[PDB]
Design a protein around this nucleic acid. Sequence first.
RNA 1: AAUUGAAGAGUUUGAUCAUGGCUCAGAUUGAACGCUGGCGGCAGGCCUAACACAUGCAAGUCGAACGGUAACAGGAAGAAG
Length: 150
Amino acid sequence: ELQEKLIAVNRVSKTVKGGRIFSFTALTVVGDGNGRVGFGYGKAREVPAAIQKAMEKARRNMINVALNNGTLQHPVKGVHTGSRVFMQPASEGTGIIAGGAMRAVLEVAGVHNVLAKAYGSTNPINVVRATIDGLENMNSPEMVAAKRGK
RNA sequence: AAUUGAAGAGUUUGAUCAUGGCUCAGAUUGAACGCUGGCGGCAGGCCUAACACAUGCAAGUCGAACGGUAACAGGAAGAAG
């Protein structure tokens, strides 16, 4: 059963001949509690349809992230535009400690305990897609074993 | 057995993305102030002028070193009815 939860929403403008006309945007991630976490982004005229459009778009862009027990295996870097992130396993307990606009995208991954921190400027739109490719670059011992002997 | 450790937001431009400053959520105090006020255990109490200081008390003991007896406590002696 897939989960969902909203992150943020802000207004925009166009300022066309008649005057200022507005629109709304939303962003949301999804996760099944066993890795395999995606996200989406969409806009519409009003929030109740905007969030629905965002979620309906979010069903695409699925990925596959290997996980071990309940903690992430090895550290990983992350870079995109103007934001950088850092992570660390911290096996067992201590829950998850992380800043805002980072908690949700990691929670649905299923990991019940991990330690992480983000560096630099942290606009939420840019910060996402950093943990994504960070998990994409992740390797478990089976893959590296598949290219070197045992 | 003796080192399990990393939370962010607000803020300009009609709206955007950055770089940049400012401020706020913590833990502390040899602490002062405002209001309020039950009990017991511990600990602590001139940073400011090394400014000038009333009055009491904070360094004496040995007669088993010595010449001695100004204040007792007893002791022979003499004057007491």
